[PDB]
């Protein structure tokens, strides 16, 4: 009987579920030994690690440090970004720097430092193979979260609740990937594996923008062929969609068309912007067409963003029990609970993919996490 049932088991340990893990810690401090919340998180990766694909070593963050794992839920937290700076002695230098936006690498080390303090909360290298329901009076009292190590042994994690923050996955029509057709996230692990070349960047958003620039880079004498404030007050009021349920960068804008202009002016165009079918990759690149030009090159990157993992497999039996919309997409409650019915007594909660897609995110990770934890504690008693 080494596995009694936990209050919560979370699947995945990226930021989203780390943010939650933090609130479980801060909650346990305020409450006594009788109201502790017992949370375990399971990460398939052997160690904590956000995205390896966009580590452009001197990019600044598109988002303000205030959107860290914790602050929008609790601004007095030992695990805010400012708090991490204080422990590495950089708070003053950062406060003086008079910016909202640090480098993408400080957030990575911040994530690593948060994930490090909360290391007891997680088993890494454990891949969840299913959430199977534990039934009594035709009621699912709790779940056996089943996990597999990298050496094959299977484990059981009883939990009244399950939280899904498995992260997301590359994407609408194009459904293939070889040795010469990459996704925007593959660019670093592959640039470091190709060594005058030719590229093509289908895409949208800053994702596709960032490749056209680095394909230039301190790098290529070759060809590369491309194919803030609106949400500062579209957020507006702290009310959101509770009255109704009752992708550009000005600096990169100019930097790239500058390159095209200056290259038009001086003739030596490393760049070629394009505006407006099948692909036939042989060994000499690819024979993909556009409405018509069966353009060919060496490699062809994209940027149609990311999408949340589909949980049906993981749900197994329970997938059937979940309310759907008119398309069979999963409905989601206001407290981020999958809609299962009174048949199912515990909850299955969602961070991550909830509604949206396409964003290389953290917009509300902190507050959603705490709202979930309070939903879990409320359901445990008055």
Give the residue ranges of DSSP H helices in 150-191. Answer: 187-191
* Residue 283, CA atoms < 13 Å, CB-side half-sphere: 0
Select the residue interacting with ligand ADP from 17, 83, 225, 340 (CB under 6 A). Answer: 17
Q: Are 158 and 3 in contact (CB under 8 A)?
A: yes
Three-class secondary structure of residue 344 per DSSP: strand
Select the residue interacting with its own copies from 33, 194, 241, 250 (CB under 8 A). Answer: 250
User: No. of H helices and E strands in the chain?
Assistant: 9, 12
CA 61 to chain centre: 15
**Options 13-21, 102-110, 247-255, 333-341: segment touching ligand ADP (CB under 6 A):** 13-21
| Nearest one of 299, 381, 366 to 23, comparing CA atoms | 366
Three-class secondary structure of residue 85 per DSSP: helix
220 binds its own copies (CB under 8 A): no
131 binds ligand ADP (CB under 6 A): no
In angstroms, give the least distance from the CB of 358 to ligand ADP: 14
Select the residue interacting with its own copies from 55, 222, 253, 277 (CB under 8 A). Answer: 253
352 binds ligand ADP (CB under 6 A): yes
365 binds its own copies (CB under 8 A): no
219 binds its own copies (CB under 8 A): no
Enter the DSSP assignment of 185. G
311 binds ligand ADP (CB under 6 A): no
Going 358 to 359 to 362 to 363, the CA torsion angle's sign is negative
**Options 133-141, 162-170, 278-286, 328-336: segment touching ligand ADP (CB under 6 A):** 162-170
67 labelled ligand-binding: no
307 vs 46, 119, 320, CA distance in Å?
Answer: 23, 27, 22
| Nearest one of 163, 207, 208 to 14, comparing CA atoms | 163
User: Measured from the CB atom, is 161 or 166 closer to ligand ADP?
Assistant: 166
56 binds its own copies (CB under 8 A): no
99 binds its own copies (CB under 8 A): yes
Select the residue interacting with its own copies from 5, 54, 61, 103 (CB under 8 A). Answer: 103
Three-class secondary structure of residue 61 per DSSP: coil
Select the residue interacting with ligand ADP from 8, 11, 114, 332 (CB under 6 A). Answer: 11
User: Measured from the CB atom, is 231 or 245 closer to its own copies?
Assistant: 231
Binding-site annotation, residues for ADP: 16, 43-45, 128
């Amino acid at each position: 009987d080494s596995n009694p049932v936990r209050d919560l088991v979370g699947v995945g340990f990226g930021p989203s579920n780390l943010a939650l893990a933090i609130a479980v810690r801060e909650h346990n401090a305020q409450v006594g030994a009788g109201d502790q919340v017992d949370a375990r998180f399971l990460e398939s990766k052997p160690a904590f690690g956000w995205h390896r694909g966009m580590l452009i070593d001197d990019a600044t963050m598109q988002v303000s440090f205030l959107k860290d794992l914790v602050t929008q839920r609790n601004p007095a937290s030992e695990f805010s970004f400012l708090s991490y700076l204080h422990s590495k002695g950089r708070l003053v230098d950062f406060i003086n720097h008079k910016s909202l936006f640090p480098l993408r690498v400080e957030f990575h080390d911040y994530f690593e430092w948060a994930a490090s303090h909360l290391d007891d909360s997680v088993d890494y290298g454990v891949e969840v193979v299913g959430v199977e329901p534990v039934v009594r009076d035709g009621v699912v009292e709790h779940f056996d979260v089943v996990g597999r190590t990298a050496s094959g042994q299977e484990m059981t994690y009883p939990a009244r609740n399950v939280v899904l923050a498995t992260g997301l996955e590359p994407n609408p029509e194009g459904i293939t990937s070889g040795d010469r057709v990459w996704h925007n996230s593959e660019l670093l692990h592959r640039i470091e594996s190709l060594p005058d070349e030719r590229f093509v960047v289908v895409g949208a958003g800053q994702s596709a923008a960032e490749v056209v620039a680095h394909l230039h880079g301190r790098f290529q004498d070759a060809q590369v062929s491309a194919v803030d404030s609106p949400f500062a007050n579209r957020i507006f009021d702290p009310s959101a969609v509770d009255d109704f349920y009752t992708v550009v960068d000005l600096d990169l804008i100019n930097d790239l068309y500058r390159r095209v202009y200056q290259e038009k002016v001086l003739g030596r165009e490393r760049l070629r912007v394009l505006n407006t079918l099948e692909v036939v990759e042989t060994d000499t690149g690819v024979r993909v067409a556009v409405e018509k030009a069966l353009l060919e090159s060496d490699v062809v990157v994209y940027a149609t963003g990311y999408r949340p993992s589909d949980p049906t497999a993981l749900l197994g039996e329970l997938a059937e029990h979940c309310e759907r919309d008119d398309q069979g997409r999963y409905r989601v409650a206001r407290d981020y609970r999958l809609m299962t019915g009174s048949a199912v007594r515990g909850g299955i909660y969602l961070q991550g993919g909830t509604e949206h897609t396409h964003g290389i995110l953290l917009s509300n990770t902190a507050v959603r996490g705490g709202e979930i934890l309070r939903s879990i504690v409320d359901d445990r008693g008055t």
